Design a protein around this ligand. Structure first.
Ligand SMILES: NC(=O)C1=CN([C@@H]2O[C@H](COP(=O)(O)OP(=O)(O)OC[C@H]3O[C@@H](n4cnc5c(N)ncnc54)[C@H](O)[C@@H]3O)[C@@H](O)[C@H]2O)C=CC1
Ligand SMILES: Cc1cc2nc3c(=O)[nH]c(=O)nc-3n(C[C@H](O)[C@H](O)[C@H](O)COP(=O)(O)O)c2cc1C
Ligand code: SF4
Ligand code: FES
Lengths: 63, 213, 430
């Protein structure tokens, strides 16, 4: 019961610096491609004093 | 010395416990003592009050304090486990605490301890068969200039000798409450060999007040 | 002035320190308390802070911050939130019991200091955090506060001023780390006594989120005498930037351990030989002196002879003044055992929030136990020093520095004794 496979391209992972060269390489070899945009996290607003508020719900219960 | 509770027959959440109405009035005064919206600040004193109703804290005063103050019970657990004042095990009627920090260890608190084991026959953290005394070892209690010193319940006994603390033990065994003060020739904190200062009379009001006050 | 010490009895602020007079209102007012306090409340917070700044009074908690700047940090308009003044009376530091005598014998001076400090920064009310084990002192303070409330001194229209004031007492639960101002603020709010990070400073965000100023007992009780006697009178004592009078607790292997008021720049040897009776076995029987309790490193006899007990000279002597608690060890003391007991006290009293103290204090306890048993190598010792350098300066609060300092002082001043002990153990047992 080893993992017997038939796909020769099952372990092909390529690394590109940005999106445009990856798209150019995908269309250069005729491979139909699906492209997903990168998801940059939103820069949060972290405040240490918010745990010690006076009239807000952000008062922590334990520390 | 454990920080996890196991469901014992003596100490269970189903153990009957309730505040007395005078304790409820004191609890309401403590609640009114604090600003509105911050009743959790009354977690520390009110739970202390519960100890003064029992002498030890089972896990029913924790849930009760959570119930009146509308706080989660785990905050009450954190408060009762972080501090060493709360007796989470059933201690005796008299709670002897001997200080053994460096200003007290320098003035031979070990003789006082060895007197306690040689008189009562229990180890540190061990209880008497009649559950009258419990001996534990504590840190500094702020009586360093009166070293050596012990405390019992809320009373301080300072400048003690092994014979003196043995006599204190016999007087407690008779039921009488001793005098919570230093037992040497000094009264509170003055030098034993006379007064170094403060022998002149106080000068009263208006001594050298600045002009234009 | 050149030679200091020998404070006059009429210039001692804390009269009835030994409990030789009445501690109630009648005994308090017959010694000079509560005199012209209405004029103090009327003259303005700016005038009160100017009189504090002229006195040169520094923080008596143990850090020596200037009290004028810290009290002037609150001179800002209100932002819809109240302001609070909290008086620290935890007294968990070994060697120091001066504030216990202040509370037990002169509570009305503390109450007047609370009122003057609360008016000085526009504080709505005052809280006093007392130790849980100080039940009788707390009861005496409650009696004094009740007698002040009943006489119209504080409460609605406090002292006939129109500025109301409330004084509260909150009892602790037996923790040394609760003496730190941010851990004290957290412990008032019902949370565990774990310190916060600065910023936000307590002057901006403190207890209940309101602006909060935390001050020591004696630096509060001195303030009415500062405001009545004058700035120049309080600034005359001691050297420059070290002005005032201090309560010194002398204890250890001394004939008469005591608490005595003195001028700031008194020499250590003169203070011991005058107000305490000297070290047992003579002055040459002295081995080591801890100048201000557990938060400062010890000093040997070669430097203790000509040292001055203020902030700057003791800082120059690679130690700290701290709480002004002179612990004395003579030549018949295993000082390795004393430092081991001190480190074990720090191990039993540590809040455990931030990891360098939480791990390194127990590491130091194990190393000190091995040193006491002598089961150690010389090359370990310098490593221990490096461990201290990984605690000092990487902690949330200053308990880590107060744990690293006595071990550093012990190593620096008594390394040959440690090497002799480990060499003797290696020679004997192997
Ligand atoms: N009195 C006692 O029983 C004990 C005293 N200590 C002493 O306590 C000291 C450590 O405590 P800390 O007060 O944290 O020392 P220190 O580093 O913080 O600061 C002194 C005071 O100045 C204030 N401060 C400084 N810069 C400020 C700024 N920019 N804005 C607002 N406030 C500012 C702090 O809030 C604090 O109240 C040590 O010197 C130690 O020896 C230690 C143990 C026990
Ligand atoms: C671990 C630790 C414990 C402290 N314990 C006390 C204490 O028991 N009493 C006290 O007045 N200050 C204590 N302090 C100092 C306080 O942080 C602060 O300096 C004091 O409340 C007021 O300082 P001040 O004299 O400048 O007003 C402690 C500091 C630390 C780091
Ligand atoms: S240094 Fe120790 S006592 Fe201070 S905050 Fe960190 S863990 Fe707590
Ligand atoms: S060292 Fe024992 S009371 Fe302080």
């Amino acid at each position: 019961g080893w993992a017997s496979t038939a796909d020769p391209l099952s372990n092909l992972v390529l690394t590109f610096s940005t999106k445009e060269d990856a798209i150019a390489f995908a269309e250069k070899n005729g491979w139909s491609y699906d492209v997903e945009e990168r998801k940059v996290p939103k820069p949060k607003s972290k405040s240490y004093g918010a745990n010690f508020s006076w009239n807000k719900r952000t008062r922590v219960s334990t520390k | 010395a454990l920080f996890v509770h196991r469901d014992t027959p003596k100490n269970n959440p189903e153990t009957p416990f309730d505040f007395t109405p005078e304790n409820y009035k004191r609890i309401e005064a403590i609640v009114k003592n604090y600003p509105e919206g911050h009743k959790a600040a009354a977690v520390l004193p009110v739970l202390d009050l519960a100890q003064r109703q029992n002498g030890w804290l089972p896990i029913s005063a924790m849930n009760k304090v959570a119930e009146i103050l509308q706080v989660p019970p785990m905050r009450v657990y954190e408060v009762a486990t972080f501090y060493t004042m709360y007796n989470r095990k059933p201690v005796g009627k008299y709670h002897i605490q001997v200080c053994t920090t460096t200003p007290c260890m320098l003035r031979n608190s070990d003789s006082i301890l060895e007197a306690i084991q040689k008189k009562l026959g229990i180890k540190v953290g061990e209880t008497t068969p009649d559950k009258l005394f419990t001996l534990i070892e504590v840190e500094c209690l702020g009586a360093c200039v009166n070293a050596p010193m012990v405390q019992i319940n809320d009373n301080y006994y300072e400048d003690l000798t092994p014979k003196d603390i043995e006599e204190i033990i016999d007087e407690l065994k008779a039921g009488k409450i001793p005098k919570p003060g230093p037992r040497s020739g000094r009264f509170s904190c003055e030098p034993a060999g006379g007064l170094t200062s403060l022998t002149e009379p106080p000068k009263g009001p208006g001594f050298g007040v600045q002009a234009g006050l | 002035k050149t030679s200091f010490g020998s404070l006059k009895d009429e210039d001692r602020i804390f009269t009835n320190l030994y409990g030789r007079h009445d501690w109630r209102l009648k005994g308090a007012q017959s010694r000079g308390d509560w005199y012209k306090t209405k004029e103090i409340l009327l003259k303005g917070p700016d005038w009160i802070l100017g009189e504090v700044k002229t006195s040169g009074l520094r923080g008596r908690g143990g850090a020596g911050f200037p009290t004028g700047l810290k009290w002037s940090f609150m001179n800002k308009p209100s932002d819809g939130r109240p302001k609070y003044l909290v008086v620290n009376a935890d007294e968990g530091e070994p060697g120091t019991c001066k504030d216990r005598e202040i509370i037990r014998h002169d509570p009305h001076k503390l109450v007047e200091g609370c009122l003057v400090g609360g008016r000085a920064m526009g504080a709505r009310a005052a809280y006093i955090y007392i130790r849980g084990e100080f039940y009788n002192e707390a009861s005496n303070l409650q009696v004094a506060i009740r007698e002040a409330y009943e006489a119209g001194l504080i409460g609605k229209n406090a002292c006939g001023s129109g500025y109301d004031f409330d004084v509260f007492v909150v009892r602790g639960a037996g923790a040394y780390i609760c003496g730190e101002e941010t851990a004290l603020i957290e412990s008032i709010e019902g949370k565990q006594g774990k310190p916060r990070l600065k910023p936000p400073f307590p002057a901006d965000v403190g207890v209940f989120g309101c602006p909060t100023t935390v001050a020591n007992v004696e630096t509060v009780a001195v303030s009415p005498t500062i405001c009545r006697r004058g700035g120049a009178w309080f600034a005359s004592f001691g050297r420059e930037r070290n002005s005032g009078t201090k309560l010194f607790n002398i204890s250890g292997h001394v004939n008469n351990p005591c608490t005595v008021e003195e001028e700031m720049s008194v020499p250590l040897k003169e203070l011991i030989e005058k107000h305490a009776g000297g070290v047992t076995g003579g002055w040459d029987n002295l081995l080591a002196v801890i100048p201000g309790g557990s938060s400062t490193p010890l000093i040997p006899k070669s430097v203790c002879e000509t040292v001055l007990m203020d902030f700057d000279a003791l800082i120059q002597a690679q130690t700290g003044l701290g709480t002004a608690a002179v612990i004395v060890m003579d030549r018949s003391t295993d000082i390795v055992k004393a430092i081991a007991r001190l480190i074990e006290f720090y191990k039993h009293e540590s809040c455990g929030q931030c990891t360098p103290c939480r791990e390194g204090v127990d590491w130091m306890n194990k190393v000190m136990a091995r040193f006491v048993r002598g089961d150690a190598r010389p090359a370990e010792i310098d490593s221990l020093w490096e461990i201290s350098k990984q605690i000092e300066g990487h902690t949330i609060c200053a308990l880590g520095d107060g744990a690293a300092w006595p071990v550093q002082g012990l190593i620096r001043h008594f390394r040959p004794e440690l090497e002799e002990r480990m060499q003797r153990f290696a020679q004997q047992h192997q």
